[PDB]
Write a protein that binds this ligand. Structure first.
Ligand SMILES: [Zn+2]
Ligand SMILES: [Zn+2]
Lengths: 77, 79
């Protein structure tokens, strides 16, 4: 059922801010069930999450959006 | 009964971020269509509110996730 990798980005300026994106990724990981999603990977600077054909159907998407917009970022799925 | 609080679900745009009434109404309608009917997700013209009926943890519920899906697909900021 969740066989697609997506990168959630928290953008400013609009380009990803790696520090805010990592923080949001970590906060999302801690505030969602542990399913493999919401692990920030340094090599390609991606907050990776796992989903189906629509990334925004993942339950963590709204959590990511809450933290990203709290810090005045624009979330991109 | 068990969902006794009214929340306004907003999809915001601009600087400063303010509700866009048309996108909010569209998202409210799409959310209504894609959730089970429980009284939520009716857009009220007199106060320009997409009214969401919930309890104490409105943002943990499945309907809010659907609102968030549509709002962010159109590049809004939900609440
Ligand atoms: Zn800040
Ligand atoms: Zn658009």
């Amino acid at each position: 059922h969740m066989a697609v990798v997506y990168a959630a980005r928290c953008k400013f300026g609009l380009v990803q801010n790696n520090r805010i994106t990592r923080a949001v990724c970590d906060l999302t990981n801690e505030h969602t069930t542990k399913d493999g999603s919401w692990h920030y990977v340094e090599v390609d600077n991606e907050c990776k999450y796992l989903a189906g054909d629509n990334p925004r159907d993942q339950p963590g998407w709204a959590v990511f959006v809450k933290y990203c917009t709290y810090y005045k970022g624009v979330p991109d799925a």
